[PDB]
Amino acid sequence: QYGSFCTQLNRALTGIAVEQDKNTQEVFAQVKQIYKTPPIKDFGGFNFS
Amino acid sequence: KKFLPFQQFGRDIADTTDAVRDPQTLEILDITPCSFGGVSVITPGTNTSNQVAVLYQGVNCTEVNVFQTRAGCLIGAEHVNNSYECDIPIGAGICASYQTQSIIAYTMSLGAENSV
Amino acid sequence: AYSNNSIAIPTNFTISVTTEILPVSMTKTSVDCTMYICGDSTECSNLLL
Amino acid sequence: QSLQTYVTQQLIRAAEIRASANLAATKMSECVLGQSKRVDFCGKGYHLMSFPQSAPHGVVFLHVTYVPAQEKNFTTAPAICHDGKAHFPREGVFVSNGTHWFVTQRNFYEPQIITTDNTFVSGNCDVVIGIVNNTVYDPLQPELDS
Amino acid sequence: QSLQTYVTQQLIRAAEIRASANLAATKMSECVLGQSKRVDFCGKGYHLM
Amino acid sequence: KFNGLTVLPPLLTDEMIAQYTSALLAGTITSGWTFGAGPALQIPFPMQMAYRFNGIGVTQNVLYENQKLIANQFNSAIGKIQDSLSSTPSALGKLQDV
Amino acid sequence: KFNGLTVLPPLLTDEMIAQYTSALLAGTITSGWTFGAGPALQIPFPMQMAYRFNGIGVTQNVLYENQKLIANQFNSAIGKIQDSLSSTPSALGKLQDV
Numbered sequence: 232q233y234g235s236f237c238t239q240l241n242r243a244l245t246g247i248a249v250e251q252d253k254n255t256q257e258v259f260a261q262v263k264q265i266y267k268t269p270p271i272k273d274f275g276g277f278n279f280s
Numbered sequence: 281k282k283f284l285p286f287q288q289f290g291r292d293i294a295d296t297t298d299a300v301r302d303p304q305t306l307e308i309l310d311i312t313p314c315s316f317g318g319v320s321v322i323t324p325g326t327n328t329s330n331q332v333a334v335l336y337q338g339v340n341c342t343e344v345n346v347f348q349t350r351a352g353c354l355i356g357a358e359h360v361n362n363s364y365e366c367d368i369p370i371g372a373g374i375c376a377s378y379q380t381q382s383i384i385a386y387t388m389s390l391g392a393e394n395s396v
Numbered sequence: 397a398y399s400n401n402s403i404a405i406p407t408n409f410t411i412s413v414t415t416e417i418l419p420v421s422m423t424k425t426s427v428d429c430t431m432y433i434c435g436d437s438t439e440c441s442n443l444l445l
Numbered sequence: 446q447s448l449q450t451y452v453t454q455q456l457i458r459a460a461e462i463r464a465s466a467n468l469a470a471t472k473m474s475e476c477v478l479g480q481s482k483r484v485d486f487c488g489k490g491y492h493l494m495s496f497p498q499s500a501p502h503g504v505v506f507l508h509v510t511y512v513p514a515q516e517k518n519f520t521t522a523p524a525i526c527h528d529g530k531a532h533f534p535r536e537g538v539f540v541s542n543g544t545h546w547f548v549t550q551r552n553f554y555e556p557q558i559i560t561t562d563n564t565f566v567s568g569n570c571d572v573v574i575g576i577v578n579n580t581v582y583d584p585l586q587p588e589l590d591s
Numbered sequence: 592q593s594l595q596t597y598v599t600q601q602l603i604r605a606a607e608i609r610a611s612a613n614l615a616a617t618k619m620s621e622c623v624l625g626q627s628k629r630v631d632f633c634g635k636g637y638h639l640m
Numbered sequence: 641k642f643n644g645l646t647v648l649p650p651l652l653t654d655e656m657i658a659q660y661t662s663a664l665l666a667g668t669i670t671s672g673w674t675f676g677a678g679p680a681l682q683i684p685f686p687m688q689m690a691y692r693f694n695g696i697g698v699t700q701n702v703l704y705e706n707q708k709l710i711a712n713q714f715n716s717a718i719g720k721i722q723d724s725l726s727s728t729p730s731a732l733g734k735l736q737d738v
Numbered sequence: 739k740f741n742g743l744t745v746l747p748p749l750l751t752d753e754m755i756a757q758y759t760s761a762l763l764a765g766t767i768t769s770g771w772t773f774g775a776g777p778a779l780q781i782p783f784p785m786q787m788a789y790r791f792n793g794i795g796v797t798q799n800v801l802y803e804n805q806k807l808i809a810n811q812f813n814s815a816i817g818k819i820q821d822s823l824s825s826t827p828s829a830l831g832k833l834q835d836v
């Protein structure tokens with residue numbers, strides 16, 4: 232009898248759920264190449280271990 | 281509309297009967313509500329004057345110094361050919377002001393032309 | 397190809413034109429609360445008061 | 446209840462749209478009215494300029510950027526030792542094709558002879574790790590010689 | 592009513608989290624992928640990396 | 641529609657927005673970044689682009705010695721923007737969502 | 739939990755996020771800021787730090803003549819970051835609150 236209230240609720244929650252993955256993608260997926268450090272960690276004394 | 285001999289009512293909105301078959305004469309007539317719309321009062325400060333203009337929003341100037349703007353019918357303001365900065369926003373590029381002393385309605389100016 | 401005495405220097409360039417799309421404004425909506433709830437009914441509007 | 450729900454969602458959506466519009470105004474100021482050094486703020490690459498275009502309910506920025514294209518390997522040194530002096534590039538980087546040393550601007554290969562107008566002297570040759578022996582030419586010596 | 596309250600609170604919290612995520616993406620672009628001259632945007636002091 | 645719901649027109653028409661964008665484009669093309677900070681100072685466009693090359697750490701002779709190639713690259717990039725815009729129907733997703 | 743409430747997993751796993759962060763770190767370490775603007779251009783890390791010293795208005799010889807001291811300072815600072823984060827948990831409250 233209440234109509235489409237909770238369909239609205241599920242739509243809002245789904246929007247939030249998608250936005251979470253969008254947030255993570257925008258933060259961390261800022262490069263399409265997967266770069267790797269050389270096996271010899273010689274950087275002139277700088278230590279990134 | 282083509283109401284087949286079994287169809288009595290008509291609903292393209294599904295909650296309001298927008299059409300109906302008259303029982304006496306089987307002519308089918310559509311039902312459109314009479315009219316409605318907002319009413320806005322354009323005024324300068326009462327610390328300046330008591331004159332007002334009235335905007336009947338989104339209605340033609342027949343349902344109601346009569347100026348048909350894209351925002352509706354304006355009554356009590358004279359339309360001027362000049363362009364100024366917006367003072368009271370009316371809508372769709374039209375603005376209103378109070379100048380010597382009457383309320384004027386005009387197309388707003390975006391700025392002075394300048395060729396480099 | 398990292399090393400302690402190697403560098404990569406570009407010898408050319410590309411002029412790149414990219415598109416960024418940003419929403420600015422929404423449709424301006426107005427609702428007549430009484431008309432939506434209690435359309436042209438005076439008993440309903442009196443109750444809504 | 447339905448009307449209140451609609452108005453609440455409209456308020457939240459309007460807040461999001463206001464954030465987007467503030468970002469658009471900032472980009473109009475910093476990318477169209479100027480050249481931005483902020484990485485990725487205007488486009489991908491080194492920002493040169495931006496052009497705005499109106500769109501229904503929004504804006505489209507055409508970001509013109511500079512992208513290095515065809516890189517080449519060279520050998521580097523942090524400084525050059527000539528007469529017990531350590532020479533450092535005023536602008537650019539010391540670069541070597543295998544046999545000869547040059548100084549280049551950092552973003553575009555343009556080899557130039559290492560000269561005293563090209564470099565500046567700081568200290569002796571015993572402090573810098575990886576300093577490379579090479580000659581630094583003085584343009585004044587031929588002029589006062591001839 | 593309880594479900595509506597939860598969903599509205601989630602929407603507001605999601606807006607705040609989205610603002611935080613946008614700031615984090617901007618800092619990833621300007622502090623990690625480059626050297627920023629914006630005072631205090633990438634730590635206290637003159638930003639190196 | 642007929643239940644007390646109305647749509648108010650924007651104050652600025654689409655033509656006025658186009659006029660503002662055209663004014664911004666003309667100012668940028670004819671005066672670079674000067675009109676933003678004050679009076680518009682005219683400068684030939686290749687010299688402005690040389691300024692911007694200096695701004696990204698590249699010497700001006702790189703632009704001047706490659707002016708035709710750079711102009712061709714820019715023109716073709718704008719043309720590719722045109723082509724892609726009229727080829728990807730999901731390009732304007734951010735606006736259509738609104 | 740038991741009343742129609744479900745928790746959806748994130749699209750990217752923690753391992754994938756770690757992979758992205760490791761790729762960013764490797765790119766920055768091996769190529770400085772070049773991989774963010776285009777192709778990754780390798781450069782010795784002391785030379786990159788000299789570039790950054792120039793970026794903050796300090797001459798390159800200041801870095802090169804103090805390379806060991808600067809590297810020791812950086813290493814000690816990173817070690818202290820590890821120590822401080824492992825010492826007190828309230829520093830991560832911003833995350834915990836979420």
Ligand SMILES: *[C@@H]1O[C@H](CO)[C@@H](O[C@@H]2O[C@H](CO)[C@@H](O)[C@H](O)[C@H]2NC(C)=O)[C@H](O)[C@H]1NC(C)=O
Nearest residue numbers: 271272273274276277278279280813816817820
């Ligand atoms: C970089 O620093 C780490 C410490 O943060 C060094 O790791 C230590 O190495 C020594 C010698 O191999 C070991 O005795 C220690 O147990 C290690 N400590 C830890 C916490 O792993 C590492 O050796 C340094 N790298 C270089 C190249 O010197």
Ligand SMILES: *[C@@H]1O[C@H](CO)[C@@H](O[C@@H]2O[C@H](CO)[C@@H](O)[C@H](O)[C@H]2NC(C)=O)[C@H](O)[C@H]1NC(C)=O
Nearest residue numbers: 519540541542543544545546547555556557558
């Ligand atoms: C490195 O660069 C130097 C200078 O550009 C090269 O030396 C020149 O080589 C050309 C051959 O094409 C000669 O005509 C010039 O007379 C040389 N100049 C000098 C000053 O000797 C050198 O060959 C390059 N080395 C490599 C491996 O490419």
Ligand SMILES: *[C@@H]1O[C@H](CO)[C@@H](O[C@@H]2O[C@H](CO)[C@@H](O)[C@H](O)[C@H]2NC(C)=O)[C@H](O)[C@H]1NC(C)=O
Nearest residue numbers: 525526527528529530570574575576577578579
């Ligand atoms: C750069 O040239 C100098 C000479 O100007 C070299 O100095 C010699 O260094 C060796 C040790 O490597 C000493 O045994 C000699 O007595 C030094 N001679 C002179 C005249 O100074 C220096 O070694 C060279 N550097 C490199 C890396 O080859």
Ligand SMILES: *[C@@H]1O[C@H](CO)[C@@H](O)[C@H](O)[C@H]1NC(C)=O
Nearest residue numbers: 285301302303304305306307
């Ligand atoms: C009902 O009566 C009226 C009046 O005589 C007539 O016009 C109409 O046709 C009648 N309805 C039908 C369905 O015949």
Ligand SMILES: *[C@@H]1O[C@H](CO)[C@@H](O)[C@H](O)[C@H]1NC(C)=O
Nearest residue numbers: 339340341342348349350352
């Ligand atoms: C108002 O009605 C007149 C009647 O001829 C018509 O010409 C005009 O276009 C109408 N204006 C609007 C805004 O509907």
Ligand SMILES: *[C@@H]1O[C@H](CO)[C@@H](O)[C@H](O)[C@H]1NC(C)=O
Nearest residue numbers: 347358359360361362385386
């Ligand atoms: C504007 O000027 C034209 C003639 O150029 C005239 O026909 C028109 O009526 C004027 N508009 C107003 C509002 O007076």
Ligand SMILES: *[C@@H]1O[C@H](CO)[C@@H](O)[C@H](O)[C@H]1NC(C)=O
Nearest residue numbers: 407408409410514515709713
């Ligand atoms: C740079 O690339 C362009 C193509 O965009 C090419 O025409 C030109 O010859 C290249 N320059 C060099 C020096 O290779």
Ligand SMILES: *[C@@H]1O[C@H](CO)[C@@H](O)[C@H](O)[C@H]1NC(C)=O
Nearest residue numbers: 397398404515516517518519
């Ligand atoms: C530089 O040398 C490495 C090998 O160590 C090679 O993989 C890389 O492609 C070279 N770079 C260029 C631009 O040729």
Ligand SMILES: *[C@@H]1O[C@H](CO)[C@@H](O)[C@H](O)[C@H]1NC(C)=O
Nearest residue numbers: 273275399400401574575576
């Ligand atoms: C670079 O590394 C090599 C070993 O591969 C070493 O012989 C050389 O001395 C190092 N040079 C510098 C400047 O670190």
